Design a protein around this ligand. Structure first.
Ligand code: RNC
Length: 167
C-alpha cells in the first residue's frame, strides 16, 4: 500500500490519472518521478521545463554538472539524479523525439529503464512536444514495464481517450 490516490487501474501493473505530473509529485513526493528528458538534459519546456521550474532551476543546475562530467545520454537511455522537492529521485528518460527524426522503435528501450525501479510516477514517454501518438506510447508502456507505474496524463480529453480506447 502506497500513497497514490484516485488512480484508475488499467492493467496488473499500470495505473492512470488525469493530473499534471508536477502537481502530483509535489503532493505525493514519490520515491521516483520520471522526467521526459532530452539527451542534453536541457529542461526548457514541456514536462522537463515544468518539473525544472518547480525545483526553482535546481534540476537544471544539477543536470548541467552531470552533462559536463558524463556527456549526453543516448536516445532510449536514462540517468538517476536528485528529485529535489518533488521526489527522492528523478529518473531522466530520453524517449525518441519524432519531430527530430528519431526512431520510434527506441520507445520500448526508453520504457525498459522503468524496470530498474519498483514504483514510479511517470508521464507517457514521447508524448507532448516529442510528437509521438500517446495511444501508442501507452501500449508500449503496458507491454514493456513490469514494475508499478503511476501515469499522470495532463490533458483530461487525452486521458479520457486513452482509457476509452485501451485494449
Ligand atoms: C505546466 N505543467 C506542464 C505539464 N506537462 C507539460 C507537457 O509538456 N506535457 C506533455 C503532456 C502529456 N500528455 O500525455 C502525457 O503523458 N504527457 C504533458 C507541460 N507543462
Amino acid at each position: 500500500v502506497n500513497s497514490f490516490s484516485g488512480y484508475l487501474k488499467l492493467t496488473d501493473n499500470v495505473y492512470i490519472k488525469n493530473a499534471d505530473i508536477v502537481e502530483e509529485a509535489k503532493k505525493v513526493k514519490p520515491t521516483v518521478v520520471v522526467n521526459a528528458a532530452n539527451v542534453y538534459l536541457k529542461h526548457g519546456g514541456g514536462v522537463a521545463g515544468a518539473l525544472n521550474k518547480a525545483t526553482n532551476n535546481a534540476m537544471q543546475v544539477e543536470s548541467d554538472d552531470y552533462i559536463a562530467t558524463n556527456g549526453p545520454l543516448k536516445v532510449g537511455g536514462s540517468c538517476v539524479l536528485s528529485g529535489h522537492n518533488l521526489a527522492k529521485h528523478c529518473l531522466h528518460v530520453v524517449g525518441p523525439n519524432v519531430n527530430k527524426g528519431e526512431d520510434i522503435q527506441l520507445l520500448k528501450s526508453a520504457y525498459e529503464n522503468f524496470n530498474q525501479h519498483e514504483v514510479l510516477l511517470a508521464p507517457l514517454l514521447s508524448a507532448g512536444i516529442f510528437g509521438a501518438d500517446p495511444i501508442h506510447s501507452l501500449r508500449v508502456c503496458v507491454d514493456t514495464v513490469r514494475t508499478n507505474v503511476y501515469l499522470a496524463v495532463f490533458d483530461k480529453n487525452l486521458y479520457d481517450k486513452l482509457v476509452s480506447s485501451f485494449l
